[PDB]
């Protein structure tokens, strides 16, 4: 699940009902493990459900899973600070 179409891929299946897209998901590093709506991050292993209207999954990432590797290599410990109450 280390490449972004690999992660696309596991959402072919992905249902129509949740308003989160599953390139964004794929983006930051969220795959499809083929149950309900649950998403794991390829890199801290990070489960992640309930997937509601207007959320960003890179915050959903910084908000649960801080010290996710990819998450600060992409954004960044200043982005994760924020998310964290942290300015
Ligand atoms: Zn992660």
Known sequence: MQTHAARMRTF????????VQPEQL??????????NDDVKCFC??????????????????AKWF???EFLIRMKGQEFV???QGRY
């Not at 983006?27 to 149950?35: C, E, I």
Request: glycine share 12%; aromatic share 16%; proline share 10%.
């Open 26 to 35: 794929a983006s930051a590093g969220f795959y499809y493990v083929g149950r």
């Open 12 to 19: 072919m299946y992905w249902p129509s009902s949740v308003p």
């Open 81 to 83: 600070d924020e998310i």
């Open 44 to 61: 801290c292993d990070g489960g992640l459900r309930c997937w509601e209207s207007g959320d960003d999954p890179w915050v959903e990432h």
């Open 66 to 68: 801080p010290r996710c």
